[model samples]
Target: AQYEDGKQYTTLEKPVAGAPQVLEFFSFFCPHCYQFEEVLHISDNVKKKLPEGVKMTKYHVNFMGGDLGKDLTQAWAVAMALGVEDKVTVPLFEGVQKTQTIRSASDIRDVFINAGIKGEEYDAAWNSFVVKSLVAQQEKAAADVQLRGVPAMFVNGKYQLNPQGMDTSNMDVFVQQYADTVKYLSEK
Candidate 1:
């Protein structure tokens, strides 16, 4: 049950720039992501744990390639474009995990509409070229890292452990381990 710090995690061949760019690659449809949200209360503490100089980013993985995948990713991008990420983030997960609805683009748009975003506003974002470009950027970034699945974490572009799941089960240990890696990398 020994945690080998960064050794336990796979180091990226091409690490990203910027100090401690911690990114979480996730998908709403991923059962693992759903479980992680529950196991870690990821919603409440993911950002609170980071120290200064560490940048946290979340990207919806679109590698799976399907209408549902496209819809979810587009929904997320649309939310960002609409400037309502805080309103959509958890509810997006809930729409999938709890309500068992939200299977298409229309459903996703409705979620935003319910969040006070007007139908036209949602449509403009969803159909905007900028949103499409951002999604492309996300896809490129995922490809750059050779992303394989959702709920994956990367620190400074290198793949890190789940930090709360997988090889590290203990939350306390996970926090220390993640902090250590971020501190060690951010200094470099």
Candidate 2:
């Protein structure tokens, strides 16, 4: 389903000037993102991929740090802020699914640190410009899209795509099709 201005979003979102923008609307708490992991990196499969100045950015899902899972995800925000996003994004998500289901921020920090990130560096960044900036942007994205759900994707501020959802058992197939559909949306 698509949301129009002031309905699904609070404002208009535009792509960065120099890149082919791929916006990932997802929350670490969402099981679907963890399940459809490989497909999320479909950019790797394309030949003339992303063209020049292409940027793929993620909007993390946060529900405040009241529980273990929630705090762990906040740790994710710290990782992203630290510029180790390329390294930590998957690990953090995987840690939640594979390593632990615990949600305390301290536990989350330890888990990510175990994955090779320094606690000191993480602490500096989590509250630094990086994490805060993206968090702000994610808030904007939510307001921009007027959505409160995880695992959503938007192409170049134009086409919006999300998973076929949980009801269907064909998650693998659904992710593949969703990737293909995005390809189609980008190409022709």
Candidate 3:
């Protein structure tokens, strides 16, 4: 079946205008998000299939982990600024969702250290102006969307994907259908 507006996807009240981009709101502590990224690999699969000129960006939601939520967002920002997201994203996710080992900023710092980032580098980025501002912007984005849950995906910051609309009987079909919807939304 073809995608339907308001069913498969809904338009944002105040659309974010810019180059086409997929913005994902997720929390490292979310079990579903962990499954999405690590088990299903849906994010990566979707990223690979995105139309050219459409980019994907991840925003760490600050609604989970209680007091540690903001700290986790900061850690994500630091990884992005340091150009080490590929190095730390999964480890951070596993630490939170699988091992249940990361509980504080200090614990997050240890992950970076283990990932080969110098202690000074991690420390500086943690306090850097850019990282601080990025964290603020991420929080603001989540608030702007009035986010209520984790693992939310927005296409072009205007169309929000509805997981219930996609065929999810199997991983292969689910990813294909998901990617197809994203491609359609990117062109719209």
Candidate 4:
């Protein structure tokens, strides 16, 4: 699928600006997202392995469209809004760990605790521009792309590979090839 570069992120959810903005459009309900968790877990470390000129950013895309999905999405926005990207990253991971049902604020809170995210900082960041922009851009992107499922990752202003159940036999194999593809595109 193609990506449309919307002006500024609605909530100022800009990454460390000038990082070539890669978007990993993921979903809370995706089995692939769950399966690919380990690879994503080491993404930050893998990032250190990049050859000096590439950066990555992730966007959590909502597959469900409604108050339910919107609410969870908003929680995500608030966490990022509060500048807790690193802190919240793991919570997001944990939230998905025992997840068999839809997510809720309480579950996220526990994830926050696990990551050591705390106090007024969490609350303050939750309402910040970072979270708002993330939420805003995500809504726009989801609507623009008309996403039908989970784990739709995009690179640059174009190119995407959503995780289809049949994309590969398993997550590790799939993501390795996908990351290789990203590496190729990075130099292109």
Best model per TM-score: 3
Superposed model 2: Cα runs more than 4 Å off:
1-20, 38-49, 63-74, 99-101, 165-176
Candidate 1 on 1-188: residue-level lDDT in tens? Answer: 34444464666767676523777778888887876665555534545656665566777887654778877887777776776878887778888878978877778877788889998878888889999987886777777777887777776776565444334657666556555554554444
| Models, CA RMSD each | 3.3, 5.7, 1.5, 7.6
lDDT per residue as tens, model 3, 133-156: 999888887877779998899887
Instruction: Kindly provide the TM-score of model 4 when superposed on the true structure, using C-alpha atoms.
Output: 0.66
Top candidate (lDDT):
3
Writing each residue's lDDT as its tens digit, candidate 4 over 3-92 gives 122311112233233324455666555555655554544244335544676667666665653554565677677665655666665446
lDDT of 4: 0.55
Candidate 3, residue 179: lDDT: 77
Question: Which wins on TM-score, candidate 2 or candidate 4?
Answer: 2
Residues 43-160, candidate 2, lDDT per residue (tens digit)? Answer: 3332234445656766665653246544554555676666566666676676566666545666667666877877777777666766666666666665665666666666666666
* Local distance difference test, each candidate: 0.70, 0.57, 0.85, 0.55
Off by over 4 Å in 1: 1-8, 17-20, 162-188
Backbone atom clashes (below 3 Å) for every candidate: 0, 12, 0, 5
Candidate 4 clash pair list: 11-133, 78-126, 81-125, 81-131, 82-125
True-vs-predicted CA distance for residue 95, candidate 4, Å? 3.4
Query: Which has the higher TM-score value, candidate number 2 or candidate number 3?
Result: 3
lDDT of 1: 0.70
Alpha-carbon deviation at 13 in model 3, angstroms: 2.7
